[PDB]
Design an enzyme around this catalytic site. Structure first.
Site, PDB file in Angstrom:
ATOM      1  N   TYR A   1       0.909  -1.134   0.000  1.00 41.79           N
ATOM      2  CA  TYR A   1       0.000   0.000   0.000  1.00 41.79           C
ATOM      3  C   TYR A   1       0.955   1.191   0.000  1.00 41.79           C
ATOM      4  O   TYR A   1       1.117   1.859  -1.017  1.00 41.79           O
ATOM      5  CB  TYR A   1      -0.925   0.062   1.216  1.00 41.79           C
ATOM      6  CG  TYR A   1      -1.964   1.135   0.963  1.00 41.79           C
ATOM      7  CD1 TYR A   1      -2.859   1.011  -0.108  1.00 41.79           C
ATOM      8  CD2 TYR A   1      -1.946   2.341   1.666  1.00 41.79           C
ATOM      9  CE1 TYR A   1      -3.686   2.064  -0.478  1.00 41.79           C
ATOM     10  CE2 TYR A   1      -2.765   3.398   1.310  1.00 41.79           C
ATOM     11  CZ  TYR A   1      -3.630   3.260   0.234  1.00 41.79           C
ATOM     12  OH  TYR A   1      -4.403   4.326  -0.176  1.00 41.79           O
TER      13      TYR A   1
ATOM     14  N   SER B   1      -4.544   0.260  -6.040  1.00 41.26           N
ATOM     15  CA  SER B   1      -4.611   1.706  -5.911  1.00 41.26           C
ATOM     16  C   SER B   1      -3.224   2.320  -5.656  1.00 41.26           C
ATOM     17  O   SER B   1      -2.329   2.163  -6.485  1.00 41.26           O
ATOM     18  CB  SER B   1      -5.599   2.028  -4.788  1.00 41.26           C
ATOM     19  OG  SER B   1      -5.459   3.346  -4.321  1.00 41.26           O
ATOM     20  N   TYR B   2      -3.025   3.021  -4.538  1.00 45.43           N
ATOM     21  CA  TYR B   2      -1.705   3.607  -4.298  1.00 45.43           C
ATOM     22  C   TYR B   2      -0.681   2.481  -4.276  1.00 45.43           C
ATOM     23  O   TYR B   2       0.491   2.669  -4.600  1.00 45.43           O
ATOM     24  CB  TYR B   2      -1.657   4.384  -2.980  1.00 45.43           C
ATOM     25  CG  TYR B   2      -0.451   5.307  -2.861  1.00 45.43           C
ATOM     26  CD1 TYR B   2       0.839   4.796  -2.703  1.00 45.43           C
ATOM     27  CD2 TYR B   2      -0.601   6.687  -2.930  1.00 45.43           C
ATOM     28  CE1 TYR B   2       1.935   5.628  -2.613  1.00 45.43           C
ATOM     29  CE2 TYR B   2       0.489   7.521  -2.845  1.00 45.43           C
ATOM     30  CZ  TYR B   2       1.754   6.985  -2.684  1.00 45.43           C
ATOM     31  OH  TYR B   2       2.841   7.819  -2.584  1.00 45.43           O
TER      32      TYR B   2
ATOM     33  N   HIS C   1     -13.658   1.104  -8.657  1.00 45.89           N
ATOM     34  CA  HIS C   1     -12.416   0.913  -7.911  1.00 45.89           C
ATOM     35  C   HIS C   1     -12.341  -0.318  -7.023  1.00 45.89           C
ATOM     36  O   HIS C   1     -11.258  -0.858  -6.798  1.00 45.89           O
ATOM     37  CB  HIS C   1     -12.086   2.144  -7.074  1.00 45.89           C
ATOM     38  CG  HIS C   1     -10.646   2.213  -6.666  1.00 45.89           C
ATOM     39  ND1 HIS C   1      -9.616   2.275  -7.584  1.00 45.89           N
ATOM     40  CD2 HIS C   1     -10.063   2.204  -5.445  1.00 45.89           C
ATOM     41  CE1 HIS C   1      -8.460   2.303  -6.943  1.00 45.89           C
ATOM     42  NE2 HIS C   1      -8.704   2.259  -5.645  1.00 45.89           N
TER      43      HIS C   1
HETATM   44  C1  LIG Z   1      -5.702  -0.173   3.279  1.00 43.46           C
HETATM   45  O1  LIG Z   1      -5.765   0.471   2.005  1.00 43.46           O
HETATM   46  C2  LIG Z   1      -6.571   1.604   1.824  1.00 43.46           C
HETATM   47  C3  LIG Z   1      -7.692   1.290   0.846  1.00 43.46           C
HETATM   48  N1  LIG Z   1      -8.245   2.616   0.585  1.00 43.46           N
HETATM   49  C4  LIG Z   1      -9.292   3.247   1.372  1.00 43.46           C
HETATM   50  C5  LIG Z   1      -9.199   4.692   0.886  1.00 43.46           C
HETATM   51  N2  LIG Z   1     -10.026   5.703   1.236  1.00 43.46           N
HETATM   52  C6  LIG Z   1      -9.804   6.919   0.655  1.00 43.46           C
HETATM   53  C7  LIG Z   1     -10.745   8.030   0.912  1.00 43.46           C
HETATM   54  C8  LIG Z   1      -8.762   7.173  -0.282  1.00 43.46           C
HETATM   55  C9  LIG Z   1      -8.666   8.616  -0.805  1.00 43.46           C
HETATM   56  N3  LIG Z   1      -9.030   8.596  -2.219  1.00 43.46           N
HETATM   57  C10 LIG Z   1      -7.925   6.077  -0.702  1.00 43.46           C
HETATM   58  C11 LIG Z   1      -7.001   6.211  -1.867  1.00 43.46           C
HETATM   59  C12 LIG Z   1      -5.691   6.700  -1.648  1.00 43.46           C
HETATM   60  C13 LIG Z   1      -4.859   6.887  -2.801  1.00 43.46           C
HETATM   61  C14 LIG Z   1      -5.349   6.585  -4.125  1.00 43.46           C
HETATM   62 CL1  LIG Z   1      -4.528   6.783  -5.530  1.00 43.46          CL
HETATM   63  C15 LIG Z   1      -6.611   6.077  -4.388  1.00 43.46           C
HETATM   64  C16 LIG Z   1      -7.385   5.913  -3.217  1.00 43.46           C
HETATM   65 CL2  LIG Z   1      -8.841   5.340  -3.673  1.00 43.46          CL
HETATM   66  C17 LIG Z   1      -8.161   4.822  -0.052  1.00 43.46           C
HETATM   67  C18 LIG Z   1      -7.675   3.433  -0.292  1.00 43.46           C
HETATM   68  O2  LIG Z   1      -6.899   2.970  -1.120  1.00 43.46           O
END
Ligand SMILES: COCCN1Cc2nc(C)c(CN)c(-c3ccc(Cl)cc3Cl)c2C1=O
Ligand SMILES: COCCN1Cc2nc(C)c(CN)c(-c3ccc(Cl)cc3Cl)c2C1=O
Lengths: 728, 728
Positions: free
Chosen positions: A509, A592-593, A702
Site C-alpha cells: 500500500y 490503488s496507491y 475501484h
Molecule cells: C488499506 O488500504 C486503503 C484502501 N483505501 C481506502 C481509501 N479511502 C480513501 C478516501 C482514499 C482517498 N481517495 C484512498 C485512496 C488513496 C490513494 C489513491 Cl490513488 C486512491 C485511493 Cl482510492 C483509499 C484506499 O486505497
C-alpha cells in the site's frame, strides 16, 4: 490438521467472522438485530426484549435495506429501493412507521430517489435532500418545508457533497448538521459549475444497444475546484407561507483570498458552531467559532476565538485537520495536534485564550479522542509496548493529567492488542472491540469503575472450526535501516521451517500515513497464499507511513513515488538476507496507491522482483483528484512542483519493465482512479516493446467488488502468482 | 545453415514485395514514380522522360504525402498535412503547382482541412469539399464558387459520405461524380440528424489531463439510418453574384415508400446518369436512367426504363448491386448478375428493352468487368481449371459469344494463377499483375494481338534473398462435405514430413462471400508460424463463402453464426484425421468477423479446439452497423429476424469457455467493431466464472495498425500460441 485455507474458502466465506454491531440509543440502552428482529438491551443488567418483530413487515412489499429509529423511539425510518452511487452516496425510498399506533404513515411521504435523510438529534424532526434540495418535516405526517430552491444536478448541491468532498473531505454524502437542540439546521452548498467532467463508457446490460457515457464533475490535480458556502436555518420558525430564511456564515478573510475548503463542522452548544477551513495549499487551516445573536438572529465569528494551524514540514493533520471535542459548556475543547517533536497528542484549548496545553506526550501517538466526560477524557493510542501497530483505550484524569489508566491492555494481552470502542450517550458504558492478533472479541463495560460486565461475542464458533485447519501464523517485527525502526509483518506458511526457503510476495500500500504492519486478525487472499501455496506474504511500513511521528510521515512531502518506493525495494533486499527467502521468487502487488508503488518498483530496474501485479493504479498524479494529490504534491505548475509531477510517473519507467512479468488490471467504470491511468501505462509499454499481461473488468469500479468480478480477479491473480513461482 | 522466416522478419518487413503502380493518363502513356521521380512512359516502346524531378519542392516546406496531376498535364495538386479519419476519409491541405510556368498559385488557395478534392475528368476544373460543403474552381487561381450552404458537422454531408456510407456503401469518402465532359457535377447529400451516436474515450498523449470523448453518427442494426438526396449542378454556368442552382433527382417510387440507400452512380454519356437504389431490406434494387433535357434544364427518369433486381434466396449482389458497364453510345451496358443456376455471369442490357441476355455461363463466376471496346469485353473470372481461388483475364468477342479466349492462363501457369488487370484509356494496352502462387509478376501488354510487350517487375531481388531461407510451402486442395467440394489451404512447414504430427492453427474469417483459400503469395504471421515454429496454418472456405455460386453463399442467409461456424469445426475434424496433424494441439483464431466465428467455435463445446484468439470480434449482431448486418440478418424486430439475433450471440455461450484457453483482444478506439462488443464478452465470462486472457490496446482502432501496436499484438499472440502448443 489435514486441510488448508483454500482459495474457495476465501471467495466463498467458508469460515465467517462474527460481529456485534449495536446502536446506542441512550445512556444505558442499545439496539441489536438478532436474526431479523430488533432487540433492545439494557447495558447494566443485560436483560433484553424484542423491539421490532421480524414479521412486522412481511407484507410490506419491498425488501428493507436499512432502518433508522427516531431519538425518542416514536417512529422508525424504512430504507428500501437502495441504489448505490459512490463510496458513501446512494439514493433510496423511505417509509415511516409509527411505533405507538403500529401503522405506516401514508400522508406527505418522503419522495422516491431521496438522496439523504436524517432525524434531529432529539425529538422526531426529519431533514432530507431530494433533487439536490433540502426539505424539513417537523412531524412525520405533515407536509415538508422547502429550504433551498437552487439545487441542480451535477452543478449545485444543497445539503450533500459533490464527488470530491464525499471522497476526500467529509468521507460522507451528508452535508447537513442539526444543532444539539434540533433547533438549527446547518448545511453546506457546493457549486461545481466550472469543474471539468471526467467521461467514461458504461456498457450496462447486454440489451443496451448504445454504450452510455457517464459524466462526473471531478477536479484532477491543479484543475478548477468546486466552491462552497455555509448556511444555518432556524427550524422552529418555519412558515408554510413564506420561504425559509437561511443565514450564511462566510469564511474567514484569510480564506477568501483564494481557493479553500470547508473541512469540518462541529456544533459546540445550542448556540455555538465550530467551523474549520483549509486553504487549497493544505498547510494552513483556520478554526472559526460562531455564536448566534438571539436579538439579530445572525451568527458572528469573532476573530478572537479564531484558532490557526500551520505546518512547515508537510500538511495539516493526518488526512485533514483534526476534529475538536468540546466540553459541555462549549467554552473549551480538546483536539489532536502534532507536538514539538512531531508526535500527535491531545491538546486542551480554552476558547478565548492563546496556545494550548498538551496533556499527553511521548514517542507514540493518539489515534483518536473517543469520549469526554466531566472527570475523564478517553482516547485510543499506540503507546503500549511501543508497538505503533497496536491500539488501546486509555483515560486521563482531567484534574490530574499525570494519571493515565490503560483500559484494554491487560484484558487479554496475548489475544487482544488492537481495540476500537463505542461509548453510550454520556459515556456511562462502552463496548470494547478487539480486532487481533487473536480472534475478534466484543465486550461491554461500565464507566464507573471500568468493570467488565459481560462478553458479547467471542467467536467461539470460528475458533473451533479453525482448529481443524492448518492456518498460517503472523509475524510482527521491525528492522533498523539507519537509526530508525521500520515495522513489517509476515504471514507465514503453517509449520514454518526457517531452514527451508520460501517464495515471497510483497503486499503493498505504502501511501501517506498508511500502515500495513499491524496486529489485526484477517482471513484474506494472503491467508490462502500462505496456507495452501506456502508463500510468505509480507508488508513493510517505510518512510511516509503513519502513526510514528512526522519525521517519518512527512519524509514523503512533495515527493510522491520516491522514498516509499525505495523503501519497499530495500525491505525485500532485507528479507532476502533472512535465510528463509528464495530470492529468485520474490513478487509484489498492490491495489490503488499500492498499484502505483508496485509499478514504480517493477520499473526501477532493481532486479529484486521477478513479477508483480498492479490493480487500478495511479500512473501520473495529474490524473488523480485535487484534494488528495495537492495535499502531498502541491500544484502542477512551474512555480510550484510541476517537475516532480513529471518525474514521478509510471510511463517514464517503461523500458525497465522488460525485466519483469507484469500484470495490469483495472475496472472500466472506475470513477475514483480513472481507467485512463492504466490506459496510459499500457500505451507506454506498447510503444517501448515490452510484453505484459492485462485484464480489464467491464463496468466494475475501484472496488471490483461485485461477487462475480471479485471471485474472478482473485482467481486470475492466483493463477498468475502460481505460474510465476512455478507452483503447479 | 539457412535461416527460418522469423517473427522479427515479419514485424520489420525484412523481405519486401516490390510493386509497379502505374497511372494510365491516356491510351498510350502512364505515370510511374521511381525514387520520388514522377516519370511518363510510352507503353508501345517503353521509352520514358522525367515529368517531375524528386528535386522539385525540395524546399516546399512541408512533407508531401501525395499528388494528383490534372487530366491534361497543366497542373499538379500537392497533398500535405494529411490527417487520417476512417477507412477512406481524411483531411489534408493542398497547394496547386503550375507546370507550364514554375510556380505555386499563391492566391485563391484550397483551404486547409479540405475533406476532398478532384480534378474534372478533362481539363483542369476542381471540386473540393470543405466544412461539409462543395466548392468549385474553374481555373486553379480563380476564386471558387460555393455549391452548397447546408453543410454542418456530423449532421449534413454534401459531397462526402457519412460513416456508414463510407464503410459499407461506396467504399470511399467521396460522393462527387463529374460528367465525362466536365460539364455537370453530380453529388449526394446525407442527413444524419436522427442517427444515434456511438461514444468512446480517446486517451491521447500522456499530457492530456482529461480523456476526450469521441462521438460518431453510427446506426447500429435496426437503428435510424441517415437519409439521402441526389443533386446535379451545371458547372459551366456558375455566377459570382448568384448562388448555383442544383437540380434534384428523386428516387424511384418503390424506394420512397420506406427506408432506402443510394448505392451506385455511373455516368452513361455527357447527358445520361445511372443511379442504383436499394431498399433497407436489401432484397430489391432499382436502376434509374436519367437523361438531361437541355430545353428544360432539368433531368428526367422514364419509369419504363428502370431495371429491377430482386433476390429470392438472399441479398442483391455480392456486397451491393453490381456496377453497370455502358457501351460507348450509352444505349446499352453490361453488368454481372446472378443467373438462374445461382452463378454470377455477364448480362447484356439494352436500355429501352426489358430483360437481358447472358454472355457467359458455367459452374464458375465472373469476378469483374475490366474493359469494354466495340469489339471486345474483358473480364476476370475463376474458371481456369475449376479453381475458385484462381483469377484469370478473359476477353469475349461481342459479335460471337462462343469465342472466349483466355489472356493470362498460359503466361506462366506454374508461377501465376491469380491475376488482376489495369487497362489504359480505350483499352489500347493493359498491365497484368499476378499475385501468386509464385512471387508477384508485373507485365505490360498490347491489346491488338495480345502481345506481351515487356516485364515491368519480376521481384528477382526478393527471389535472391529467399534463396537463403527455409520458406514454407502452400497446399491448395479440397474436401467433400455432403456431396460438395469446399476448398482449403495449408501453409506447411519447410521439409514437411507427412509421417510426423504437427500442431495445427486454423486461420478463420468466414464472413459472407469470403475467400481464404486462394493462390496468392503472402509473407505474413502465418509464414513465420510454419517456418520457425513449425505450425501448420490452415484456412477453410465453407458455407457462406463466395465466388462459388449462390447455393453456397446464401446458405448463411438470415442465419449468421450458424453454418459457417459448424463448417470450421467440421474442417478441423477432417484435418485432425490426416496423419500429419496432432489432434491435441488444434488452435483457432481470427480478426473481426473471424473473431466472432473464433469465439462461437470456442464456445460450441465441440472439444475439438485446445485454445483460440479473437481480435476485435463482433459478439452480438445488434451491436454492428445496419447496412452490413441487416444485409444478411434482416431487421432485429419480432415481425422479422429478432429471434436469431438473440440466438447468435457469443455471450450465450459463456459456460463452454471453461473447456478452452481464450485470448480476447480489442483496441479501445475502435470505431468499426466497438470495444463494447468485446467488453460484453468478458463480462459474460466473468459472470459465469470462466478464466481467460485479455489485452486492450489504448487508442488503437480496428486495424491495431500503429507500428508499435502491430508489433506488440503479434508478439503477444505468438507467446500465447507457443505456450499452448508446448513449443519451446
Ligand atoms: C488499506 O488500504 C486503503 C484502501 N483505501 C481506502 C481509501 N479511502 C480513501 C478516501 C482514499 C482517498 N481517495 C484512498 C485512496 C488513496 C490513494 C489513491 Cl490513488 C486512491 C485511493 Cl482510492 C483509499 C484506499 O486505497
Ligand atoms: C481478409 O479479411 C477481410 C478484412 N476485412 C476487410 C473489410 N472491409 C469491409 C468494408 C468490411 C465491412 N465493414 C469488413 C468487415 C466485415 C465484417 C465485420 Cl463484423 C467487420 C468488418 Cl470491418 C472487412 C474485413 O474484415
Amino acid at each position: 490438521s489435514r486441510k488448508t485455507y483454500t482459495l474457495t474458502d476465501y471467495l466463498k466465506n467458508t469460515y465467517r467472522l462474527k460481529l456485534y454491531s449495536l446502536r446506542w440509543i441512550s445512556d444505558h440502552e442499545y439496539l441489536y438485530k438478532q436474526e431479523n428482529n430488533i432487540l433492545v438491551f439494557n447495558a447494566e443488567y443485560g436483560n433484553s426484549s424484542v423491539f421490532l418483530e421480524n414479521s412486522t413487515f412481511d407484507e410490506f412489499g419491498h425488501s428493507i435495506n436499512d432502518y433508522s429509529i427516531s431519538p425518542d423511539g416514536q417512529f422508525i425510518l424504512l430504507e428500501y429501493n437502495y441504489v448505490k452511487q459512490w463510496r458513501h452516496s446512494y439514493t433510496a425510498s423511505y417509509d415511516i412507521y409509527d411505533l405507538n399506533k403500529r401503522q405506516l404513515i401514508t400522508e406527505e411521504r418522503i419522495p422516491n430517489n431521496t438522496q439523504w435523510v436524517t432525524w434531529s438529534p432529539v425529538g422526531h424532526k426529519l431533514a432530507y435532500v431530494w433533487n439536490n434540495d433540502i426539505y424539513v418535516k417537523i412531524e412525520p405526517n405533515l407536509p415538508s418545508y422547502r429550504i433551498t430552491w437552487t439545487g441542480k444536478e451535477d452543478i449545485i448541491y444543497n445539503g450533500i457533497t459533490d464527488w470530491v468532498y464525499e471522497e476526500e473531505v467529509f468521507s460522507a454524502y451528508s452535508a447537513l448538521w442539526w444543532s444539539p437542540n434540533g433547533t438549527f439546521l446547518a448545511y453546506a452548498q457546493f457549486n461545481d459549475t466550472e469543474v471539468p467532467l471526467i467521461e467514461y463508457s458504461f456498457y450496462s446490460d447486454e440489451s443496451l444497444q448504445y454504450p452510455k457515457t457517464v459524466r462526473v464533475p471531478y477536479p484532477k490535480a491543479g484543475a478548477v475546484n468546486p466552491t462552497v458556502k455555509f448556511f444555518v436555518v432556524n427550524t422552529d420558525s418555519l412558515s408554510s407561507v413564506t420561504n425559509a430564511t437561511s443565514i450564511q456564515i462566510t469564511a474567514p478573510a484569510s480564506m477568501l483570498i483564494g481557493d479553500h475548503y470547508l473541512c469540518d463542522v462541529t456544533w459546540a452548544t445550542q448556540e455555538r458552531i465550530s467551523l474549520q477551513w483549509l486553504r487549497r495549499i493544505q498547510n494552513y487551516s483556520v478554526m472559526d467559532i460562531c455564536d448566534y445573536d438571539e436579538s439579530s438572529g445572525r451568527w458572528n465569528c469573532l476573530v478572537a476565538r479564531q484558532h490557526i494551524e500551520m505546518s512547515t514540514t508537510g500538511w495539516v493533520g493526518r488526512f485533514r485537520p483534526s476534529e475538536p471535542h468540546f466540553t459541555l459548556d462549549g467554552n473549551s475543547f480538546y483536539k489532536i495536534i502534532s507536538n514539538e517533536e512531531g508526535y500527535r497528542h491531545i491538546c486542551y484549548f480554552q476558547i478565548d485564550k492563546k496556545d494550548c496545553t498538551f496533556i499527553t506526550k511521548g514517542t507514540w501517538e493518539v489515534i483518536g479522542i473517543e469520549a469526554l466526560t466531566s472527570d475523564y477524557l478517553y482516547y485510543i493510542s499506540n503507546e503500549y509496548k511501543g508497538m505503533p501497530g497496536g491500539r488501546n483505550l486509555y483515560k486521563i484524569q482531567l484534574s490530574d493529567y499525570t494519571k493515565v489508566t490503560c483500559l484494554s491492555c491487560e484484558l487479554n494481552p496475548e489475544r487482544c492488542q488492537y481495540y476500537s470502542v463505542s461509548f453510550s450517550k454520556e459515556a456511562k458504558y462502552y463496548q470494547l472491540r478487539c480486532s487481533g492478533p487473536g480472534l475478534p472479541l466484543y465486550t461491554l463495560h461500565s464507566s464507573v469503575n471500568d468493570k467488565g460486565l459481560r462478553v458479547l461475542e467471542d467467536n467461539s464458533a470460528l475458533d473451533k472450526m479453525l482448529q481443524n485447519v492448518q492456518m498460517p501464523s503472523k509475524k510482527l517485527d521491525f528492522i533498523i535501516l539507519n537509526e530508525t525502526k521500520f515495522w513489517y509483518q509476515m504471514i507465514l506458511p503453517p509449520h514454518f521451517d526457517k531452514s527451508k526457503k520460501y517464495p515471497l510476495l510483497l503486499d503493498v500500500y505504502a501511501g501517506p500515513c498508511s500502515q500495513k504492519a499491524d496486529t489485526v486478525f484477517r482471513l484474506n487472499w494472503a491467508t490462502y497464499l500462505a496456507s495452501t501455496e506456502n508463500i510468505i506474504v509480507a508488508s513493510f511500513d517505510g518512510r511516509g507511513s503513519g502513526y510514528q511521528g512526522d519525521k517519518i510521515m512527512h519524509a514523503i512531502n512533495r515527493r510522491l513515488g520516491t522514498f516509499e518506493v525505495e523503501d519497499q525495494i530495500e525491505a525485500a533486499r532485507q528479507f532476502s538476507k533472512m535465510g528463509f527467502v528464495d530470492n529468485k521468487r520474490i513478487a509484489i502487488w498492490g491495489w490503488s496507491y499500492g498499484g502505483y508503488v508496485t509499478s514504480m518498483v517493477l520499473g526501477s530496474g532493481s532486479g529484486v522482483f521477478k513479477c508483480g501485479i498492479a490493480v487500478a493504479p495511479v500512473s501520473r498524479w495529474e490524473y488523480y483528484d485535487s484534494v488528495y494529490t495537492e495535499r502531498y504534491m502541491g500544484l502542477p505548475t512551474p512555480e510550484d512542483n510541476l517537475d516532480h509531477y513529471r518525474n514521478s510517473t509510471v510511463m517514464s519507467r517503461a523500458e525497465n519493465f522488460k525485466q519483469v512479468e507484469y500484470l495490469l488490471i483495472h475496472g472500466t467504470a472506475d470513477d475514483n482512479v480513472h481507467f485512463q491511468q492504466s490506459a496510459q501505462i499500457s500505451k507506454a509499454l506498447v510503444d517501448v516493446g515490452v510484453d505484459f499481461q492485462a485484464m480489464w473488468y467491464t463496468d466494475e469500479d475501484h472496488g471490483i467488488a461485485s461477487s462475480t468480478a471479485h471471485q474472478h480477479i482473485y482467481t486470475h491473480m492466483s493463477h498468475f502468482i502460481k505460474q510465476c513461482f512455478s507452483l503447479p
